[PDB]
Write a protein that binds this ligand. Structure first.
Ligand SMILES: Nc1ncnc2c1ncn2[C@@H]1O[C@H](COP(=O)(O)OP(=O)(O)OP(=O)(O)O)[C@@H](O)[C@H]1O
Ligand SMILES: Nc1ncnc2c1ncn2[C@@H]1O[C@H](COP(=O)(O)OP(=O)(O)OP(=O)(O)O)[C@@H](O)[C@H]1O
Ligand SMILES: [Ca+2]
Ligand SMILES: [Ca+2]
Lengths: 360, 361
């Protein structure tokens, strides 16, 4: 049955429609020496002898030879399947240019000979996975954050906002502020540590200025992190300062609005009629929305921006790290969907532009 | 505020109006007549029946003559609605299972002949379900020329599960004409056909239990009703009242092989995956003039209930405004703020030719 490939700036997720989870998740990295290319964990573990390139920049593909290598690796290496035997559902960023969507289609039929394929907007899948066709998706990943208003299955272009602030940026920041504390993480292995601390110990303060005040006057918020070798390194206010940068992006030297303001602006950019539904259906997705306390904080921040009237509801599924993928698995495994596949016949008739009839 | 145009093409009648309105402004017979000014459409063509050759360009929901359909749309814009079509977006409707080739042509005509700034094509059934406030359910749409059963799920018609029944209003009027002749009335003239139709629309009803009602008709006159003609001549009608629309359930009455409307609906539901049937059974929506019979909803309820698994919650929704529910759906859909995203622009037409319509969604 169908393949589901969720291309990401940091990681790709691949598996089979109908499964609870992707069977493979690997770094979106292509390495070349001076075999003539390696992808993923294999490339990383040969870092010292390969030139590394990241083909997906901020959700958008910028190098097509490398992206084809990732897909080749996905099929013949990770999933160990013949692509000419399975329908393939691929995902795309919001506001992906038509030119890109056509190239994806071209590669699938012409290089991989897929019998059928489809391209869905990642955000629409996340909303789908939550059992909705209307709402606003806040998707924060490794490379980008998007706020994507959706109404009855239709993502609204005029109202989509992009924020080039995500996971990398947060890991980068935690690295910087731990250095402050007297720790040093210059190597690439030491970066894996920082990222681990970020994913295990960080959290969003409800009230940031009080949280600062508590930390300055109490140790009740400090937690210790144990390294492989047994070395324990203590983390204090950097636990909540790091993710705070999502709400106060000046922390990273950036001249952009927080995630909360950006969400509000996206809603505000819609016709006054559907806002009630967007406000009451704000859905969080992506690894960078995984911090404890984030949903409470969003609730409070949006509440503060929105008219008093509005019921505000933030939905933060526990499955949200993979909600894009799980959406793809749900969509591609419905019999009611098998109608929506774009076949080799239609492509050899209409060519790469037929893909724009994606209703997802 | 510039309102979009909503044109519901139909086998018997076309309905036209402006998005936002409760109702189409114009409803007129889908007829193009030509003599042997060189063409007339609608009521104007009928009233000159004697000197024109009338043709029906929409046979069973599907356009079969493009020259004539073009005339119908010209008449709609410039004659019935009195608008320049290049000032307004146009939403047109199409039958279920409309071939790709016909969609292309519709699109071509709109941009190339009528210079519309934007257009959109919706499946009639999907609009009926939409007008009822739903995105999931099954629509039983019975009109003048055709009956379709159309399962829809989350805004999407399931074409594999769509069933077509070439039995509708025309067939029922023809039948009532036959059985009224049985009793000793003559309705030969086309004028007189208007009478039979009128009787069909005013006095007919669906019996809940047919055989029972036959016996009621046989044993007292309590079911007889009299119809008065313009000239004052009264004609009485008894069992023909319910026998006529019964043909929808028992098509053998018309000499036809086909299953009834209730079987057809059931089969359509059965053709769908089991994990959605619960929803289809609970959301069965009736649309089209031929579903206007009193008693029809009760009868469907009982008939489907008899066919369906016993555990199943059956619900037949028969809106009062169901004669125009297709149109009302179009007017709802086009009056939406997010409609603009959904349509095809003039810009996209210069770009991707008339095939743009398989590339829309
Ligand atoms: N428990 C966690 N808490 C905080 N952040 C996390 C957690 N787990 C993963 N992340 C972060 O989420 C990011 C990856 O998430 P995701 O897979 O949604 O993004 P992506 O799809 O690779 O990239 P993008 O969507 O930006 O193109 C990484 O930066 C990672 O550090
Ligand atoms: N009140 C009524 N009771 C019974 N039948 C009616 C009533 N009103 C209209 N009809 C019948 O319905 C038919 C017209 O239906 P409608 O306009 O919904 O469909 P259409 O678009 O003309 O046909 P098609 O579905 O084939 O495209 C005519 O045969 C008409 O006599
Ligand atoms: Ca992603
Ligand atoms: Ca109709």
């Amino acid at each position: 049955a169908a393949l589901v490939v969720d291309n990401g700036s940091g990681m790709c997720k691949a598996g089979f429609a109908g499964d609870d989870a992707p069977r493979a998740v690997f770094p979106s990295i292509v390495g070349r020496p001076r075999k003539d290319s390696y992808v993923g964990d294999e490339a990383q573990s040969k870092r010292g002898i390969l030139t590394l390139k990241y083909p997906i920049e901020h959700g958008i593909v910028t190098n097509w030879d490398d992206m084809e290598k990732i897909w080749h690796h996905t099929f013949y290496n990770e999933l160990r399947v013949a692509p000419e035997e399975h329908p393939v559902l691929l995902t795309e960023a919001p506001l992906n240019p038509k030119a890109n969507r056509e190239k994806m289609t071209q590669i699938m039929f012409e290089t991989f000979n897929t019998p059928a394929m489809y391209v869905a907007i990642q955000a629409v899948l996340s909303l789908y996975a939550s059992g909705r066709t209307t709402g606003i998706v806040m998707d924060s990943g490794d490379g980008v954050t998007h706020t994507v208003p959706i109404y009855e299955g239709y993502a609204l272009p005029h109202a989509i906002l992009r924020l080039d602030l995500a996971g990398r940026d947060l890991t980068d920041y935690l690295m910087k502020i731990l250095t402050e504390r007297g720790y040093s993480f210059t190597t690439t292995a030491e970066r894996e540590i920082v990222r681990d601390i970020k994913e295990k110990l960080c959290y969003v303060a409800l009230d940031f200025e009080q949280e600062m005040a508590t930390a300055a006057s109490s140790s009740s918020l400090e937690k210790s992190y144990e390294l492989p070798d047994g070395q324990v390194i203590t983390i204090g206010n950097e636990r909540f300062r790091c993710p705070e940068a999502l709400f106060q992006p000046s922390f990273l030297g950036m001249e952009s609005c927080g995630i909360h303001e950006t969400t509000f602006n996206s809603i505000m950019k819609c016709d006054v009629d559907i806002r009630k539904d967007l406000y009451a259906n704000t859905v969080l997705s992506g690894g960078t929305t995984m911090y404890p306390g984030i949903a409470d904080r969003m609730q409070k921040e949006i509440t503060a921006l929105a008219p008093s009237t509005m019921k505000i509801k933030i939905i933060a599924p526990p499955e949200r790290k993979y909600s894009v993928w799980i959406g793809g698995s749900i969509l591609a495994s419905l019999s009611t969907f098998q109608q929506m596949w774009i076949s080799k016949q239609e492509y050899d008739e209409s060519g790469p532009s037929i893909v724009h009839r994606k209703c997802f």
